[PDB]
C-alpha cells in the first residue's frame, strides 16, 4: 500500500488471478481494477492506520498482502496499515574502514528476546568498541522461534520481536549512541510456510532452486515485477527505518542471466542513498566486490569463510564437511596475505577448481570472523569455538581476526566468553514441515536436539555470564586495532615456523605461538597486549623461547 492525502492506494500484482477483492475487516469488500500487466488497484478514502486487511482471490480464499508492512498475527494472519513517516538521513555516518561488526539474533540476545532488549544493551556494545550491529533477518517468519531465514514477508517486521515500532526505536536509539545498524536481508529464497506468492504470479524461478526452497524469478517471463519487488524492499528499509546498510544472504544463490545483474542493481540502490552492502558469497569471486569498471557488482564487502575455516580447522583439528579443504598453518598465512585460500585451485570438498585471485583490493572489501550464526549453529551440538580449543587458542583466534586487515565481525557473546550452545530452532505449525525439519537437521547436521522444541531455543539464549579476562582482552584488541591503523591495510609481512607465526604490519607486530617454541624475532617494540604474563614489556631483535600464547607490540 501507499498512503496519499487522506486516501490510500492498494496495489497487488497477481497475473495468475482473474479478479481480486480487497477485504478490509471492519469495513466491506472492494473490487479491484485490473491492468494488462496483472496489477490490481483501488484508491480508498475510508481507510486509516491501523486497519487490518486481506485479499480474496478467484478461489474465494483469503490471503495476506505479500508486500505487508506488518503481520500482527503471524504469517497466516491479516495485514495491517502502519505509519509511513519517511524520515531518513541522506547519509550514514558509518565509515566502512572503521567498521567493527557485532552479529545479533534478537530472539536469543537478551532474556527479553525483543528490540527493546537489544536497546538495553546498546551502552555495553558502544563501550566494547563496536561501530555497527548486524541484525539477523527480521522479515516476518512463522511463530516466535527462528534464525530469520524462514522469513516470508520481506516488508514486515517480526511481530514477536516488537514489530515496526520497536525496530524504528532500535535504529533511532543506536544512532543516538553513535552505533550503526546493518540489516540481514534474504533475496535468494523464501520460507516454506506462510508464503502465498506462488498463487499470485511467477515470483519464483522454475529454472533452479536453492537447498532452502525455490529462488526468485529475475531473468525470465514476467521478472520485471519481481526485480521491482526486491529493489523496492531495499529502498523501503532505508527510507522507512533509516537502516545504515545490508548483509545480503547467500548471493551465490541469486542467479541472473540479465544484461545487468540484480546484485549490481541492489548495490546501485544502496549507494544512491549513501549506504553500505556486505554480501555473503560462497563464490570466492572478486566480481561481487569489484568496481563496475572492472566488471563487478560493486558490493562494498563480502564474507570470507576461508579466513574462519583456516583458523578453525587448524586449531580444532577438525576435518568434517567443508573443513576437509583446510587444516594447515599455510592456509591461515595464505588467507592473511591473499584473502582467499581457494583462489582458483582444486577443492576436494567441492570436487572442482574453485575461486579466483582477488587482486590489489584493500582489506575493507572483506569481512572476517571466528564465530557466527552459521559456524556455531550448523554444528549438530551447536558448540561455540570456546568448547573446541583451550583458553590460549581462543585468545589467539580472537587476536588473529581482530588484528587482520579485514572488517572483523564478533558473534554475540564471543567477546565475554559465552559457553552456551547456539542451536538451529524453528517454530512451524504445519505438521509436514515439523516432520521435515527434525529429520533434515538430524541427517544433514547431526542435530539431536529438536529444532521445534522450545528448550532448544531457550538453551541458545546468551547467559551474560561475564568472563572478565576474555572481555578485557577483546576490549583492548578492538582499541589497539583502531590505534594502530590496522584497518584495510594489506601490506603485512608474515613469517611462520612449525608451531608459530609472526605477523608484522606498518605500526605493529604480533606473535602467535601455538606451542612452546624458539622464535627469531626481527623487530623491536613495546608491549600493547598479551594473552599471558610471560611476554616482556620491551622486546628486541633476537632469539626467544616462548610458551603458547599471543603478544602484540608497537
Ligand atoms: O559449501 C561450503 C560452505 O557451506 C556452507 O554454506 C552454505 O550454507 C549456509 C548455511 O545454510 C548458507 O548460509 C546462509 O543461507 C542459509 C539459507 O538462507 C541459512 O541457512 C539456515 O537457515 C535455513 C532455513 O531455515 C536452514 O535450512 C534448513 O531448514 C529448513 C527448515 O526446515 C528447511 O526448509 C531446509 O531444507 C533446511 O536445509 C539451514 O539449515 C540453516 O543453516 C544460513 O543461516 C545463512 O547464513 C550459505 O549461503 C551456503 O553457502 C557454510 O556455511 C560455509 O561456511 C561453507 O564455506
Amino acid at each position: 500500500y501507499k498512503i496519499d492525502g487522506n486516501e490510500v492506494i492498494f496495489t497487488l500484482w497477481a497475473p495468475y488471478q482473474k479478479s481480486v477483492k480487497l477485504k478490509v475487516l471492519e469495513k466491506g469488500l472492494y473490487e479491484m481494477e485490473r491492468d494488462e500487466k496483472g496489477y490490481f488497484t483501488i484508491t480508498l478514502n475510508n481507510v486509516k492506520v491501523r486497519d487490518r486487511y486481506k485479499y480474496v482471490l478467484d478461489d474465494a480464499s483469503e490471503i495476506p498482502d505479500p508486500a505487508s508492512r506488518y503481520q500482527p498475527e503471524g504469517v497466516h494472519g491479516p495485514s495491517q496499515i502502519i505509519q509511513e513517516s519517511k524520515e531518513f538521513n541522506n547519509e550514514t555516518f558509518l565509515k566502512k574502514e572503521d567498521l567493527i561488526i557485532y552479529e545479533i539474533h534478537v530472539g536469543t540476545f537478551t532474556p527479553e528476546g525483543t528490540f527493546e532488549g537489544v536497546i538495553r544493551k546498546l551502552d555495553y556494545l558502544k563501550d566494547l568498541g563496536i561501530t555497527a550491529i548486524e541484525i539477523m533477518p527480521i522479515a516476518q517468519f512463522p511463530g516466535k522461534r527462528d534464525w530469520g531465514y524462514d522469513g516470508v514477508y520481506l516488508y514486515a517486521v517480526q511481530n514477536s520481536y516488537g514489530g515496526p515500532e520497536g525496530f524504528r526505536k532500535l535504529v533511532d536509539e543506536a544512532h543516538k549512541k553513535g552505533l550503526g545498524v546493518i540489516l540481514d536481508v534474504v533475496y535468494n529464497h523464501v520460507g516454506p510456510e506462510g508464503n502465498y506468492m506462488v498463487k499470485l504470479g511467477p515470483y519464483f524461478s522454475q529454472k533452479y532452486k536453492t537447498p532452502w526452497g525455490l529462488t526468485f524469478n529475475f531473468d525470465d517471463a514476467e521478472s520485471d515485477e519481481v526485480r521491482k519487488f526486491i529493489l523496492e524492499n531495499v529502498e523501503y528499509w532505508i527510507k522507512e527505518y533509516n537502516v545504515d546498510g545490508f548483509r545480503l544472504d547467500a548471493v551465490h544463490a541469486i542467479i541472473d542471466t540479465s544484461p545487468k545483474h540484480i546484485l549490481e542493481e541492489i548495490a546501485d540502490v544502496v549507494h544512491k542513498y549513501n549506504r553500505i552492502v556486505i554480501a555473503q558469497s560462497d563464490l570466492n569471486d572478486p566480481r561481487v566486490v569489484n568496481p563496475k569498471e572492472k566488471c563487478g557488482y560493486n558490493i562494498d564487502a563480502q564474507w570470507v569463510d576461508d579466513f574462519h575455516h583456516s583458523i578453525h580447522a587448524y586449531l580444532t583439528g577438525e576435518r568434517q564437511g567443508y573443513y576437509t579443504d583446510f587444516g594447515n598453518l599455510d592456509d591461515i598465512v595464505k588467507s592473511y596475505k591473499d584473502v582467499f585460500v581457494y583462489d582458483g585451485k582444486y577443492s576436494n570438498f567441492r570436487r572442482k577448481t574453485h575461486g579466483e585471485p582477488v587482486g590489489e583490493l584493500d582489506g575493507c572489501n572483506f569481512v572476517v570472523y571466528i564465530q557466527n550464526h552459521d559456524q556455531v549453529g550448523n554444528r549438530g551440538k551447536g558448540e561455540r569455538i570456546i568448547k573446541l580449543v583451550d583458553r590460549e587458542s581462543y585468545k589467539i583466534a580472537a587476536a588473529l581476526y581482530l588484528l587482520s586487515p579485514y572488517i572483523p565481525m564478533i558473534f554475540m557473546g564471543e567477546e565475554y566468553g559465552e559457553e552456551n550452545p547456539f542451536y538451529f530452532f524453528s517454530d512451524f505449525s504445519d505438521s509436514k514441515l515439523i516432520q521435515g525439519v527434525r529429520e533434515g537437521r538430524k541427517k544433514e547436521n547431526g542435530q539431536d536436539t529438536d529444532p521445534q522444541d522450545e528448550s532448544t531455543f531457550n538453551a541458545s539464549k546468551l547467559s551474560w555470564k561475564i568472563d572478565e579476562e576474555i572481555f578485557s582482552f577483546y576490549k583492548i584488541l578492538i582499541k589497539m586495532r583502531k590505534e594502530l591503523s590496522i584497518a584495510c591495510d594489506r601490506r603485512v609481512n608474515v613469517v611462520n615456523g612449525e608451531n608459530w607465526l609472526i605477523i608484522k604490519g606498518r605500526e605493529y607486530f604480533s606473535l602467535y605461538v601455538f606451542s612452546k617454541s624458539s622464535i627469531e624475532v626481527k623487530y623491536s617494540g613495546t608491549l600493547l597486549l598479551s594473552s599471558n604474563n610471560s611476554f616482556p614489556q620491551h622486546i628486541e631483535e633476537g632469539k626467544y623461547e616462548f610458551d603458547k600464547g599471543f603478544a602484540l607490540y608497537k
Side-chain angles (χ1 to χ4, degrees):
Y1 75 93
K2 46 220 81 192
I3 19 175
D4 204 282
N6 74 314
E7 52 201 32
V8 54
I9 317 158
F10 289 84
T11 320
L12 190 268
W13 183 63
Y16 292 167
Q17 227 70 216
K18 277 190 168 75
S19 72
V20 200
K21 302 160 174 62
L22 216 208
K23 193 205 178 195
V24 185
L25 276 276
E26 307 286 56
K27 284 87 181 182
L29 270 83
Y30 307 106
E31 192 77 74
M32 306 205 281
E33 211 207 37
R34 193 198 207 276
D35 80 36
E36 215 218 58
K37 298 278 190 77
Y39 281 99
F40 289 84
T41 32
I42 3 91
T43 309
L44 263 50
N45 37 21
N46 53 288
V47 178
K48 178 62 181 155
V49 37
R50 20 82 188 276
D51 297 327
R52 275 102 185 270
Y53 67 107
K54 274 174 179 277
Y55 291 112
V56 40
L57 318 167
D58 306 323
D59 230 12
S61 66
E62 304 175 345
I63 66 117
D65 183 12
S68 187
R69 276 80 213 262
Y70 186 44
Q71 215 60 206
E73 275 151 30
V75 300
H76 308 288
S79 307
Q80 191 176 300
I81 308 295
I82 72 158
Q83 198 54 78
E84 281 211 313
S85 64
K86 273 169 186 176
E87 269 79 2
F88 70 101
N89 298 105
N90 53 252
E91 264 221 346
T92 183
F93 52 68
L94 276 182
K95 272 186 155 71
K96 100 153 149 85
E97 78 169 53
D98 290 340
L99 219 34
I100 321 279
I101 305 179
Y102 193 99
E103 188 186 29
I104 286 164
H105 170 80
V106 169
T108 55
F109 189 52
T110 59
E112 291 101 315
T114 65
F115 299 126
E116 196 68 65
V118 38
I119 287 159
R120 186 175 51 80
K121 251 56 179 69
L122 253 28
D123 286 336
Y124 162 82
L125 267 2
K126 178 63 183 176
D127 182 78
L128 173 56
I130 260 66
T131 62
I133 53 171
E134 177 167 309
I135 281 78
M136 285 171 60
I138 60 160
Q140 183 75 232
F141 48 73
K144 334 172 96 182
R145 298 172 245 116
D146 201 83
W147 287 9
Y149 307 96
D150 293 320
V152 90
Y153 291 88
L154 249 33
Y155 293 79
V157 178
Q158 181 69 22
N159 61 345
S160 60
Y161 287 172
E165 214 166 297
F167 185 58
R168 192 77 194 85
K169 206 174 102 94
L170 172 58
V171 43
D172 286 340
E173 290 302 305
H175 290 336
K176 214 91 101 297
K177 311 278 181 177
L179 295 163
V181 15
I182 294 171
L183 180 59
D184 196 334
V185 283
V186 183
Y187 300 140
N188 63 77
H189 81 95
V190 138
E193 189 186 327
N195 194 81
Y196 296 93
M197 296 193 299
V198 67
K199 288 225 272 170
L200 301 187
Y203 275 98
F204 312 105
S205 170
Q206 295 318 319
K207 288 162 185 175
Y208 82 98
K209 70 177 208 302
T210 72
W212 327 289
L214 344 85
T215 194
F216 281 106
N217 170 42
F218 288 128
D219 55 7
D220 202 359
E222 235 134 350
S223 53
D224 274 15
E225 277 41 74
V226 15
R227 292 178 85 85
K228 219 187 86 171
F229 190 89
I230 269 82
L231 290 169
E232 278 176 27
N233 187 253
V234 352
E235 190 187 331
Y236 168 84
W237 285 122
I238 295 171
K239 287 184 172 183
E240 280 295 326
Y241 296 94
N242 204 202
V243 166
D244 295 299
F246 303 90
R247 176 261 187 196
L248 303 180
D249 188 49
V251 311
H252 47 278
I254 297 161
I255 302 176
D256 190 13
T257 58
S258 304
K260 181 176 283 169
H261 200 111
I262 187 76
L263 286 172
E264 184 179 319
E265 301 212 69
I266 288 172
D268 274 353
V269 182
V270 334
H271 295 142
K272 194 204 181 183
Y273 302 106
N274 306 287
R275 306 295 136 113
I276 299 168
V277 247
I278 295 156
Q280 182 199 44
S281 181
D282 191 46
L283 290 180
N284 269 18
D285 188 341
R287 78 153 68 109
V288 171
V289 126
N290 275 317
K292 285 193 266 200
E293 59 271 5
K294 312 232 281 184
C295 312
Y297 311 140
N298 205 230
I299 311 288
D300 290 292
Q302 63 149 98
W303 287 22
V304 183
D305 276 336
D306 280 6
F307 198 89
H308 159 96
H309 297 352
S310 287
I311 291 164
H312 176 99
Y314 175 69
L315 293 176
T316 60
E318 281 191 350
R319 305 286 180 273
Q320 12 69 79
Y322 46 82
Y323 295 125
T324 194
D325 275 347
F326 305 83
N328 298 135
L329 226 201
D330 291 354
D331 297 320
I332 302 175
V333 5
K334 173 71 178 173
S335 192
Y336 230 95
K337 45 213 285 279
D338 292 342
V339 188
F340 298 139
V341 183
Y342 285 84
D343 64 342
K345 72 153 173 169
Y346 196 84
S347 154
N348 289 330
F349 176 65
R350 304 166 185 275
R351 299 176 291 334
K352 73 172 207 65
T353 296
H354 185 249
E356 173 70 16
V358 100
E360 287 300 310
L361 300 166
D362 75 31
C364 293
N365 297 98
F366 314 103
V367 351
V368 302
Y369 36 82
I370 62 164
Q371 295 284 249
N372 64 36
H373 77 268
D374 277 337
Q375 303 315 327
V376 183
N378 292 309
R379 302 177 63 89
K381 295 169 184 180
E383 297 171 294
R384 306 173 86 115
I385 202 163
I386 201 156
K387 307 294 282 174
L388 314 164
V389 299
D390 70 19
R391 285 195 66 91
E392 284 304 341
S393 282
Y394 189 79
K395 292 168 170 185
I396 287 159
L400 281 158
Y401 89 98
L402 284 159
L403 298 174
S404 81
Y406 317 119
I407 292 160
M409 194 186 72
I410 306 173
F411 180 58
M412 58 165 200
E414 179 195 325
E415 79 280 14
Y416 62 73
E418 177 66 62
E419 290 198 40
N420 287 352
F422 188 79
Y423 288 115
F424 186 80
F425 41 87
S426 51
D427 200 8
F428 297 109
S429 63
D430 184 50
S431 59
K432 262 294 302 294
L433 308 168
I434 301 168
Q435 168 112 259
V437 71
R438 296 190 181 110
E439 295 174 336
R441 277 331 220 84
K442 196 92 169 73
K443 198 77 75 69
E444 258 62 84
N445 306 74
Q447 201 186 150
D448 281 291
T449 57
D450 187 350
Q452 287 286 120
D453 275 11
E454 203 197 309
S455 57
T456 304
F457 171 83
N458 295 344
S460 311
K461 296 171 176 167
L462 302 203
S463 65
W464 286 102
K465 207 219 306 285
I466 313 151
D467 182 310
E468 292 175 327
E469 179 180 278
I470 310 276
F471 179 86
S472 176
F473 187 80
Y474 274 78
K475 210 208 211 279
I476 296 159
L477 223 37
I478 293 154
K479 193 206 175 182
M480 260 23 261
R481 163 191 252 265
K482 306 177 177 176
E483 213 151 301
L484 258 16
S485 292
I486 280 174
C488 321
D489 190 7
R490 291 225 280 144
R491 293 165 308 169
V492 287
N493 185 69
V494 8
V495 186
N496 71 125
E498 213 204 289
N499 299 120
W500 61 268
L501 68 81
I502 314 287
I503 297 165
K504 187 262 182 185
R506 219 226 333 151
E507 292 186 26
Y508 86 100
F509 66 95
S510 282
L511 276 39
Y512 304 89
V513 198
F514 311 104
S515 297
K516 180 162 165 182
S517 50
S518 296
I519 302 159
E520 264 281 351
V521 178
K522 267 92 215 309
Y523 315 103
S524 303
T526 80
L527 188 68
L528 257 27
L529 178 73
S530 168
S531 69
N532 278 169
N533 284 11
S534 46
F535 290 100
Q537 205 61 49
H538 309 286
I539 203 164
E540 276 171 34
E541 336 211 327
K543 170 155 262 190
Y544 301 94
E545 178 165 67
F546 291 121
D547 291 273
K548 191 185 213 268
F550 146 83
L552 206 203
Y553 286 92
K554 259 189 81 187

